[PDB]
Amino acid sequence: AGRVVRITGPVVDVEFPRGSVPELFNALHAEITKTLTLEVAQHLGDSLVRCISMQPTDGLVRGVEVTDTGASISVPVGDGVKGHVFNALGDCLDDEHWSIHRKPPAFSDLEPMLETGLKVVDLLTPYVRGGKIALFGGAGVGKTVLIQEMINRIARNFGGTSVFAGVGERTREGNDLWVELADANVLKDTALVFGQMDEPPGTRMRVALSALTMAEFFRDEQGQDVLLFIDNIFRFTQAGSEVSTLLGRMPSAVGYQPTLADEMGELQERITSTRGRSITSMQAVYVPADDYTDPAPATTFAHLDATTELSRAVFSKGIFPAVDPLASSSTILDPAIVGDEHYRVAQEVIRILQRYKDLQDIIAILGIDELSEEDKQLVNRARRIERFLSQNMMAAEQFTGQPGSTVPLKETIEAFDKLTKGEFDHLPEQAFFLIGGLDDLAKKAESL
Amino acid sequence: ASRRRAMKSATDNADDLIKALTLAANRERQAQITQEISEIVGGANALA
Amino acid sequence: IGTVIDAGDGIAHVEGLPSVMTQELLEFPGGVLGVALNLDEHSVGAVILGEFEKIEEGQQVKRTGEVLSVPVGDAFLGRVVNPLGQPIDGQGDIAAETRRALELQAPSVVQRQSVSEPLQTGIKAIDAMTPIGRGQRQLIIGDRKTGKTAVCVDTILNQRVRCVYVAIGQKGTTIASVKRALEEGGAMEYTTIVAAPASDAAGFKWLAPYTGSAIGQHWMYNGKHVLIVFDDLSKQADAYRAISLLLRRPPGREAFPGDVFYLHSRLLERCAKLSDELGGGSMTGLPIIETKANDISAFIPTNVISITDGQCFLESDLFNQGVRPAINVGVSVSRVGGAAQIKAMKEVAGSLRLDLSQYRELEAFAAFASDLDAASKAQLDRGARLVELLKQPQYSPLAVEEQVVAIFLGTQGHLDSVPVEDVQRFESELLEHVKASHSDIFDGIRETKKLSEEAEEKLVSVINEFKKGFXXXXXXXXXXX
Amino acid sequence: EIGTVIDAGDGIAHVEGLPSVMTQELLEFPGGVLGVALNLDEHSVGAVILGEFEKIEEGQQVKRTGEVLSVPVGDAFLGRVVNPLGQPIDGQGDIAAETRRALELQAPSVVQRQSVSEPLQTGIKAIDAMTPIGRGQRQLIIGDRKTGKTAVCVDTILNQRVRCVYVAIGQKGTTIASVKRALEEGGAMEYTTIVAAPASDAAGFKWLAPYTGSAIGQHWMYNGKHVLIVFDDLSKQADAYRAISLLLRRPPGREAFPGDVFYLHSRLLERCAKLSDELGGGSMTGLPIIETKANDISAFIPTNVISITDGQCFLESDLFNQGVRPAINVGVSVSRVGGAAQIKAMKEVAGSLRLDLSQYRELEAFDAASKAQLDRGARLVELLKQPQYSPLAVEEQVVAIFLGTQGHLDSVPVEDVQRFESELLEHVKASHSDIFDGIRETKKLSEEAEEKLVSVINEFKKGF
Ligand SMILES: Nc1ncnc2c1ncn2[C@@H]1O[C@H](COP(=O)(O)OP(=O)(O)O)[C@@H](O)[C@H]1O
Ligand SMILES: Nc1ncnc2c1ncn2[C@@H]1O[C@H](COP(=O)(O)OP(=O)(O)O)[C@@H](O)[C@H]1O
Ligand SMILES: [Mg+2]
Ligand SMILES: [Mg+2]
């Protein structure tokens, strides 16, 4: 047992008897005049322990008893976590417990393509097993619809579960997500962790660890490819800066914490593929001042494999998913990892779409007439390629009407091969709209 | 035909100019923040 | 009992008070109040909520045994009060037994419902493009003299929903002029005015938003709808910065404390739309932030932007150029969107945003007249006229049925024949005509919340007839071709 | 002697006792975690922790080792993966080596050096030709993320099949594993030591990682053997030192860095040198890396390292995306040693190669004479392009450059230059091995060999 000495915002100093001082990052409970969870930070001296509060420190008094758990903040793990809602501390918000803090595996021991089923992703921006994907999109474009899809597909096909982490989320959006998952009936194969903007910086710091720890057990023990959805990862780094200042650390470049790369490094490295199985992290990343040179987004980009840029222009056309094929990229798109054929087709598709985009300005004024015979055909193919990239989503039954379709890698490669060569020049533009396999193209072609 | 060429290059040059200034702006933006804070924290450490 | 050791700059260190609570109300011996923030090893750092001129070393301070609380009720409606809840207007005392704590936890994840109830500001630009729902948080951000307060006042006038205008770091004469504006419109009767002016200490400015929120929460939990306005959080942030620096808390970015984001977070989150189980009341927020040289990238703006559910960025260049309100369409967003719009507005202003996005892209070409094709020329002529409809005079909120008709006119291309400069007068005279003669069309939109095929054909005939009557101000007149 | 911890936090620890403790002495906490005594105060000892400090508390007992910061060295480290301290992470037994070296050691003096006149072949056409690297030289590899900085270093190590020392600082584990895997495939791991201080590790490890890798290399250097060290990268090691300094409450300067951030990189890189004949005549080549932000060479940390190193190889994003891989900007990139670090064969053929391509890029931006230069230049670019993990021998490079420069590819289309190069080398490898053998031995192209090549090319063109 200890006694509270000093309180200054979310920082609390506690006295303990000489040689019974709690270890660092250990959870300490204290009764409010509710139970407040404090986490140890520094050893001031004379058996004084400076701690960071995980909830508001309003109602505390000097001399109040503080109990030592003798371990870091524990959170629930297993199949019971699925279809539930938790906080950073690991308490049920819908009315074994392992520590959140742990080092990642050694790099020598870590094993050195994640088939989604979507044509646009697999071809142009293929995801990685144990890799880090970034979901760029405007306001109300199609982030949640896509995350629900990735849950649905990998849960159904591969059988692996998912874990969502609302790191400084809007509480309103959390309520919207809950109902969205409830209607789709994908709550059962999804775990939810929430540490919204309302809570102090202490929560937003550790909330990411709690959700990650749960995912790590699904990875290690169950032996399955688990999904980790983080929104937003920047807010962890932001929270890191907030606590850093109050702890009394001198700020670094652009007023960030000096241990920015370290804090991020410890989190991101845990999100990795082991020999047994992998964890695929679909992260959202804020870019302050639209400045990619800013330390926060600059450091994050080092950890990441893939990017998916959703554009409003493609959304306005009615192309779902509205992935920007040019802007979006993936590191693993090389002839070594994925073979020469895939690389050849992928780049050739990009070439056609790029030239189409260049001619938009000329077509806007003059039109198709002024273009050459070759360009006329390229524009025709480009438009058909744009519409073929559209696909039915399993999650989007309420939206579209028709059920979703999953397209293997071999089907994807062969399809775009035939399109580039110009074997489907006779078919209409409507035939390519919202279809999976090549059989469904030909079937819809006859009806029209 | 000559205007097309002339104004095309001008537009390409403008694109390049924007990129150079935008970097210079962000350089200054980050620097000004870093510089102000160091002076503020410097004064704080002076007392205690 | 405790004794003051140090005093100055609205701060006081107190000896004693061994079992004092955090954020507890203390009373100095002159009757001035204080707040125990920092409970140190051998002292208690207290911020003074009042004049500290007769607070000295040796003076005796006592405990109240209460965390900050403020009275609430229907009595506050049409009254002007300070953070503590004392009336300044001078219209008797506030008869209300019910009280609420300033610091209260916001509704949980389960204790909320999705926002699907429009809160009509009465401003065409906002309602159409960036709609605000009941329980939503919409930031109003921009430079000085861009029309931030004007939008909030016009919103309050259009509710003629309980209103709570919180003034932080404002000059007295401004708050008086705002009160005068509400009296003229006749919107003061359902409006509470919390005021923490510049003369007041930092403590008042720091508290001002929390007090205004607490007043609104009383209605929220009872199952009634509220609108709160913070004018502005920029000054409240500056006030907290002052307090923290005086208490010797370590500064961060822009000399602000670590929990400057946390300050705004707890405040804004309390604004929400409750579940059906808890009545189903709401509490809409309109926070304000004062940018410097249109710097959105700044620390405090970015903090509030990341909290709120969309932003309405006002620009100086647009305001001066004649676009009033000066809402930048591209940057401004509504996170709720169509959910906080009636079906009538959703249909007409569905592809208004798309047309104007194309217009701004084209705009460059407009100067070079008749050097383009036909399609682009029509878009420019259409776009230019749409801008004139979005323009709106100060202190003139329009009803939702009047807005839908005005937008329907422009979007369908009924103003294409009329000159651009005469669009504003055409709109005004048209609404007057429909108000008088064709009230059934307005009534239909009010009830059904949609524009019927009958109403469409009715409007077309009404427009055509009016065009013939309408005398064009500039040059000759033109009806149709 | 024994001491007790008074204060602890943020990877720093104040210790009571240890009265006769040395400066920069290795201390051992009671959990087995190590530390370094930096600040010896009046009534305390400021120590930086080289490990996790989660189970380091007030009252815990710390002991002296009686040794100033030092790491074991030898032949045992070859084909092993170790941390800064020198503990194996790969899990392939312990490191049997009695010989040790201090981390902080003075670099060779002015008199204890010899001018660099020994080529270190990277096996990359662009580098070897334009910006050559000699034994003892320091060549900076600088550019944005995903420009191919690491790739160049790995290809260099593969081409040595000279002892290699790949130092990884602030790297993800999976990357270091993939680098190790690449060395195993090529079969270059046997003569390669891998020092690894990944992102998870504390700032201390990142700060130390380069100094440990340098110390390992110095053992070979002083014995009169040649070494190549690779820092990947110093940008993160700088950031690590910034963190430490700010935690210790040292006053920040430009870009929130301490005053001795330049001094940090200076002592490290200078230790890389070419010793005199009196001291064996061993070498220790350096390939430091810096990560620029939006191709900002003007930034503080880049400018610091640029001013230290003996030339730079600036990689560009625009060039990389456009297809030029490696994406070395010819105009900006330089070699300070130059022709001295080139064999006579390469010196002759690639004497005015960098100048011609500098003129090409100028002309590209915008006659008969100018048209020919553009057609020539465009084809030269295709030769400079090189696939990943494919180092070419020096004799193969000189022939490929000789082909382009003299204008043997002018008749052939630009797109078919890459295949022409591959098939040509296969022909010469099979039939005319004597030409390659001549260049290997003599290190020069004879007038006979020139006329031989011309006839071989002409005959092949007909067949092609
Ligand atoms: N839509 C409008 N049309 C015409 N004038 C306006 C409009 N909105 C505001 N104004 C005028 O411009 C001024 C803007 O100042 P103010 O409301 O103080 O902006 P801020 O609150 O952002 O400083 C007001 O005094 C008002 O008279
Ligand atoms: N010579 C080359 N040719 C083609 N691609 C290359 C070459 N060198 C590197 N790359 C590509 O660049 C990517 C990143 O290389 P890397 O050396 O890790 O860059 P960085 O060091 O900037 O991260 C790899 O995925 C690889 O495919
Ligand atoms: Mg105002
Ligand atoms: Mg690299």
According to DSSP, the β-strands at D2-9 and D12-17 are antiparallel
Give the span between the Cα atoms of A229 and A161, in whole angstroms.
11
Q: Is C173 annotated as a binding residue?
A: no
Give the span between the Cα atoms of C133 and C120, in whole angstroms.
8
Reading the block at residue C328, the tokens are 């930048």
DSSP-derived letter for residue D392 is P
Shared-domain flag, residues A312 and A415: no
**Any C CB within 8 A of A201 CB:** yes
- Is ligand 2 within 6 A of the CB of residue D326? yes
Shared-domain flag, residues A321 and A374: no
Shared-domain flag, residues A148 and A47: no
**Ligand 1, from C394, C395, C398, C424: best to mutate by most atoms within 8 Å of Cβ?**
C394
| CATH superfamily of domain region D343-463 | ATP synthase alpha/beta chain, C-terminal domain (1.20.150.20)
Ligand 4 mean position to D219 CA, how many Å?
27
Pick left, alpha or beta for residue A301 (phi over 0 → left; psi -120 to 50 → alpha; otherwise beta): alpha
Reading the block at residue A331, the tokens are 């590191």
In angstroms, what is the resolution? 4.0
Which residues neighbour A388 within 8 Å (Cβ) at sequence distance 6 or greater? Answer: A119, A415, A416, A419, A432, A435, A441
| CATH superfamily of domain region C342-481 | ATP synthase alpha/beta chain, C-terminal domain (1.20.150.20)
Largest CA distance in chain C: 89
Q: Which residue from D415, D419, D375 is spatially nearest to D400, judged by alpha carbons?
A: D419
Question: Helices C423-436 and C453-469 sit at what angle, rounded to 10 degrees?
Answer: 120
Give the span between the Cα atoms of C215 and C211, in whole angstroms.
6
Q: Is C440 annotated as a binding residue?
A: no
Shared-domain flag, residues A213 and A184: yes
Touching status, chains C and B (3+ beta-carbon pairs under 8 Å): yes
Which residues neighbour D83 within 8 Å (Cβ) at sequence distance 6 or greater? Answer: D89, D195, D196, D197, D201, D205
Residues 83 to 142 of C: which have CB under 8 A from any A CB? 103, 106-110, 112-115, 135
Q: Give the helix/strand (H/E) hosting A374.
A: helix A373-388
* Closest atom, ligand 1, to C-alpha of C150: 17
Contact D388 A301 (CB under 8 A): no
Give the span between the Cα atoms of C460 and D214, in whole angstroms.
84
- The pair phi, psi for residue B18, each rounded to 5°, is -60, -45
Shared-domain flag, residues A2 and A125: no
Asked if residues A55 and A195 have their Cβ atoms less than 8 Å apart, the reply is no
Size of interface A-C (CB pairs under 8 A): 149
Question: Which amino acids of C are annotated catalytic?
Answer: 335
Please list the residue range(s) of chain C that carry CATH number 2.40.30.20: 1-66
Please give the radius of gyration of chain C, using alpha carbons only, rounded to the nearest integer. 26
- The pair phi, psi for residue A283, each rounded to 5°, is -105, 150
DSSP-derived letter for residue A302 is G
Helical segments of D189-232, H only: 203-223
Chain C interface, mutation test: which of B7, B26, B35, B37, most C Cβ atoms within 10 Å?
B37
Give burial (CB, 10 Å; 0-12/13-18/19+) of C284: buried
- With vertex at residue C322, the alpha carbon angle to CA C316 and CA C323, rounded to the nearest 5 degrees, is 75
Give burial (CB, 10 Å; 0-12/13-18/19+) of A367: exposed
Helical segments of A282-372, H only: 295-300, 312-317, 340-358, 360-365
CB contacts of B44 in chain C (<8 Å) are: 250-251
C26 pairs with which residues across the strands?
C34, C63
C-alpha distances out from residue D182 to A107, A112, C225, D91, Å:
15, 10, 65, 19
Reading the block at residue A358, the tokens are 């260049």
Residues 250 to 309 of D: which have CB under 8 A from any A CB? 252, 255-256, 293-294, 296
User: Chain D: nearest CA to B1, how far in angstroms?
Assistant: 17
Residue A53, amino acid = S
Q: Which residue from A82, A32, A28 is spatially nearest to A218, judged by alpha carbons?
A: A82
Q: Which residue from D132, D121, D205 is spatially nearest to D169, judged by alpha carbons?
A: D205
Contact A62 C23 (CB under 8 A): no
| C253 closest CB neighbour out of A94, A197, A255 | A255
CATH class name, domain C67-341: alpha beta
* Helix (H/G/I), strand (E/B), else coil: D50: strand
Give the span between the Cα atoms of C134 and D441, in whole angstroms.
85
Give the span between the Cα atoms of D377 and D354, in whole angstroms.
11
CB contacts of C254 in chain B (<8 Å) are: 33, 36-37
For residue D108, is the peptide bond before it cis, meaning its omega torsion is within 30 degrees of 0? no
Residues 5 to 64 of D: which have CB under 8 A from any A CB? 5-10, 14, 52-59
Q: Which residue from D242, D237, D264 is spatially nearest to D254, judged by alpha carbons?
A: D242
- Is ligand 2 within 6 A of the CB of residue D292? no
Reading the block at residue C356, the tokens are 């104007």
**Ligand 2, from D174, D236, D325: best to mutate by most atoms within 8 Å of Cβ?**
D325
Contacts by C169-172 with C-beta closer than 8 Å and gap 24+? C169/C196, C169/C197, C169/C198, C169/C205, C169/C232, C169/C235, C169/C236, C169/C238, C169/C239, C170/C195, C170/C197, C170/C198, C170/C231, C170/C235, C171/C197, C171/C198, C172/C197, C172/C199
Reading the block at residue D19, the tokens are 């009265």
- Is ligand 1 within 6 A of the CB of residue C394? yes
| D242 closest CB neighbour out of A101, A105, A258 | A258
Q: Which residue from D170, D253, D177, D258 is spatially nearest to D208, judged by alpha carbons?
A: D170
> Domain holding A256: CATH number?
3.40.50.300
CA torsion through residues A244, A250, A256, A260, sign? negative
Q: Which residue from C283, D434, D271 is spatially nearest to A172, judged by alpha carbons?
A: C283
Ligand nearest to the Cα of D171, by number: 4
Give the span between the Cα atoms of D8 and A437, in whole angstroms.
62
Which residues neighbour A13 within 8 Å (Cβ) at sequence distance 6 or greater? Answer: A4, A5, A6, A7, A44, A48, A49, A50, A51, C41
Please list the residue range(s) of chain D that carry CATH number 2.40.30.20: 1-67
Which of A72, A100, A122 marks a domain boundary? Answer: A72
CB contacts of D239 in chain A (<8 Å) are: 261
Reading the block at residue C176, the tokens are 């008086």
> Domain holding A16: CATH number?
2.40.10.170
DSSP secondary structure, A46-106, as one string: SSEEEEEESS--TT-BTT-EEEE-SSSPEEE-SGGGTT-EE-SS--BS---EEES--PPPP
Ligand 4 mean position to A331 CA, how many Å?
12
User: Chain A: nearest CA to D140, how far in angstroms?
Assistant: 20
For residue A290, is the peptide bond before it cis, meaning its omega torsion is within 30 degrees of 0? no
Shared-domain flag, residues A326 and A400: no
D195 pairs with which residues across the strands?
D82, D167
Asked if residues A288 and A324 have their Cβ atoms less than 8 Å apart, the reply is no
CA torsion through residues C120, C124, C126, C130, sign? positive
| A108 closest CB neighbour out of D6, D54, D91 | D91
Interface partners of D (3+ CB pairs, < 8 Å)?
A: A, B
D336 is catalytic: yes
**CA–centroid distance for D58 within its chain:** 42
Please list the residue range(s) of chain D that carry CATH number 3.40.50.300: 68-342
- The pair phi, psi for residue C374, each rounded to 5°, is -90, -45
**Ligand 2, from A299, A329, A331, A340: best to mutate by most atoms within 8 Å of Cβ?**
A331
Give the span between the Cα atoms of D348 and D402, in whole angstroms.
9
Give the span between the Cα atoms of C372 and C365, in whole angstroms.
8
* Closest atom, ligand 2, to C-alpha of D315: 22
Contact D200 A265 (CB under 8 A): yes
| B23 closest CB neighbour out of D255, D256, D294 | D294
For residue D251, is the peptide bond before it cis, meaning its omega torsion is within 30 degrees of 0? no
* Helix (H/G/I), strand (E/B), else coil: A148: helix
Shared-domain flag, residues A280 and A313: yes
CA torsion through residues A178, A183, A188, A190, sign? negative
> Domain holding A372: CATH number?
1.10.1140.10
Pick left, alpha or beta for residue C8 (phi over 0 → left; psi -120 to 50 → alpha; otherwise beta): left
DSSP E strands, B1-48: none
Contact D296 B42 (CB under 8 A): no
For residue C222, is the peptide bond before it cis, meaning its omega torsion is within 30 degrees of 0? no
- With vertex at residue D267, the alpha carbon angle to CA D266 and CA D272, rounded to the nearest 5 degrees, is 95
* Helix (H/G/I), strand (E/B), else coil: D45: strand
Q: Which residue from D162, D167, D155 is spatially nearest to D122, judged by alpha carbons?
A: D155
Give the span between the Cα atoms of D60 and D67, in whole angstroms.
21
Q: Which residue from D408, D412, D409, D423 is spatially nearest to D454, judged by alpha carbons?
A: D408
Which residues neighbour A426 within 8 Å (Cβ) at sequence distance 6 or greater? Answer: none
Query: What is chain D's length?
Result: 464
Please list the residue range(s) of chain D that carry CATH number 1.20.150.20: 343-463
Q: Is C467 annotated as a binding residue?
A: no
User: Chain D: nearest CA to A319, how far in angstroms?
Assistant: 27
Which residues neighbour D241 within 8 Å (Cβ) at sequence distance 6 or greater? Answer: D203, D206, D207, D258, D261, D264
CA torsion through residues D120, D121, D122, D126, sign? positive
CB contacts of C297 in chain B (<8 Å) are: 29
Give burial (CB, 10 Å; 0-12/13-18/19+) of C395: exposed
Please report where in the chains the tokens 């494999």 appear, as a residue: A305
Q: Nearest 10 degrees: CA dihedral of D14, D20, D23, D26?
A: -70
* CATH for the stretch D68-342: 3.40.50.300
Reading the block at residue D403, the tokens are 């082909």
Which residues neighbour A283 within 8 Å (Cβ) at sequence distance 6 or greater? Answer: A132, A133, A134, A135, A229, A230, A231, A233, A304
Nearest CA in chain A to D244: A258
Please report where in the chains the tokens 């004092």 appear, as a residue: C20
User: Chain B: nearest CA to D256, how far in angstroms?
Assistant: 7
Contact C254 B33 (CB under 8 A): yes
Residue A87, amino acid = N
Architecture label for domain C1-66: Beta Barrel (2.40)
Ligand 3 mean position to C325 CA, how many Å?
14
Give burial (CB, 10 Å; 0-12/13-18/19+) of A181: buried
Q: Which residue from D301, D327, D298 is spatially nearest to D234, judged by alpha carbons?
A: D301
Give burial (CB, 10 Å; 0-12/13-18/19+) of C71: buried
C191 pairs with which residues across the strands?
C163
User: Chain A: nearest CA to D23, how far in angstroms?
Assistant: 24
Asked if residues D170 and A261 have their Cβ atoms less than 8 Å apart, the reply is yes
Residue B47, amino acid = L
Asked if residues A137 and A306 have their Cβ atoms less than 8 Å apart, the reply is no
Ligand nearest to the Cα of C171, by number: 3
The neighbourhood of ligand 3, an ion, using CB within 5 A, equals C 149
Which residues neighbour B7 within 8 Å (Cβ) at sequence distance 6 or greater? Answer: none
3-state secondary structure chain C: CEEEEEEECCEEEEEECCCCECCEEEECCCCCEEEEEEECCCCEEEEEECCCCCCCCCCEEEEEEEECEEECCCCCCCCEECCCCCECCCCCCCCCCCEEECCCCCCCCCCCCCCCCECCCCCHHHHHHCCCECCCECEEEECCCCCHHHHHHHHHHHCCCEEEEEEECCCHHHHHHHHHHHHHHCCHHHEEEEEECCCCCHHHHHHHHHHHHHHHHHHHHHCCCEEEEEECHHHHHHHHHHHHHHCCCCCCHHHCCCCHHHHHHHHHHCCCECCCCCCCCECEEEEEEECCCCCCCCHHHHHHHHHCCEEEEECHHHHHHCCCCCECCCCCEECCHHHHCCHHHHHHCCCHHHHHHHHHHHHHHHHCCCCCCHHHHHHHHHHHHHHHHHCCCCCCCCCHHHHHHHHHHHHHCCCCCCCCCCHHHHHHHHHHHHHHCCHHHHHHHHHHCCCCHHHHHHHHHHHHHHHHHCCCCCCCCCCCC
Contact B34 D255 (CB under 8 A): yes
Give the span between the Cα atoms of D95 and D82, in whole angstroms.
9
* Helix (H/G/I), strand (E/B), else coil: A424: coil
CB contacts of A18 in chain D (<8 Å) are: 59
| Fold classified for D1-67 | Elongation Factor Tu (Ef-tu); domain 3 (2.40.30)
According to DSSP, the β-strands at D61-68 and D2-9 are antiparallel
Contact C250 A248 (CB under 8 A): yes
Question: Helices A260-270 and A234-247 sit at what angle, rounded to 10 degrees?
Answer: 140
Asked if residues D139 and D335 have their Cβ atoms less than 8 Å apart, the reply is yes
C-alpha distances out from residue C434 to C254, C416, C459, C466, Å:
54, 20, 9, 10
CB contacts of B41 in chain C (<8 Å) are: 250-251
Give the span between the Cα atoms of C446 and C402, in whole angstroms.
10
Q: Which residue from C279, C266, C283, C166 is spatially nearest to C217, judged by alpha carbons?
A: C283
Reading the block at residue A343, the tokens are 């690389």
Please report where in the chains the tokens 């938009």 appear, as a residue: A360
User: Chain B: nearest CA to A289, how far in angstroms?
Assistant: 9
Contact A45 D6 (CB under 8 A): yes
Contact A139 C333 (CB under 8 A): yes
Shared-domain flag, residues A320 and A437: no
Shared-domain flag, residues A158 and A275: yes
According to DSSP, the β-strands at D100-102 and D70-72 are antiparallel
- The pair phi, psi for residue A428, each rounded to 5°, is -75, 170
Range of the domain at A33: 1-72
